[PDB]
Amino acid sequence: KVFGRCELAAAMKRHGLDNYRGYSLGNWVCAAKFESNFNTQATNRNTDGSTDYGILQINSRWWCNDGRTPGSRNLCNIPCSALLSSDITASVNCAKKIVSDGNGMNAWVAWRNRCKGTDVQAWIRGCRL
């Protein structure tokens, strides 16, 4: 599923991501924009052999099981394919664990490089929320 901007903002809010660990909704929408262009089916292989999955590009090195990332963990206790669903529940619940791990949203390199310190509220501007 390719979400609309305001559609994803609303789904993220319903799932409790708005202001989760202090990160306003626009931060999450901005991260999803640059990680996946709002496409739940996005996958990308990393140089270390792990793969990133879903709207928030969650990595198989630590967070989900894909059966092909040696020495990895599955800290969200989910198959990585669950992060590709049109229903964002699995991605949101796993993202909550990631953002609580110590470094906040810096876990998402694209958030740090493209959203952090910008006017992230623009990503939810105009949305009925």
CA torsion, points 27, 85, 53, 59, in degrees to nearest 10? Answer: 80
Binding of Ru ion by 101 (CB under 5 A): yes
Residue nearest to Cl ion (CB): 26
Binding of Cl ion by 113 (CB under 5 A): yes
d(CA 50, CA 113): 21
| 101 annotated as a binding-site residue | yes
Exposure string over 27-54, b if 16+ CB within 10 A, otherwise e? bbbbbbbebbebebebbeeeeeebbbbb
57 binds, among Cl ion, Na ion, Ru ion, none (CB under 5 to 8 A by kind): none
d(CA 62, CA 59): 6
101 binds, among Cl ion, Ru ion, Na ion, none (CB under 5 to 8 A by kind): Ru ion
Binding of Na ion by 72 (CB under 5 A): yes
Residue 78 token pair: 């989910």
Residues with a known catalytic role: 35, 52
Q: How far is the CB of 31 from Na ion (least distance, A)?
A: 13
Q: 18 or 52, CB closer to Na ion?
A: 52
Residues that bind Cl ion (CB under 5 A): 24-26, 110, 113, 121
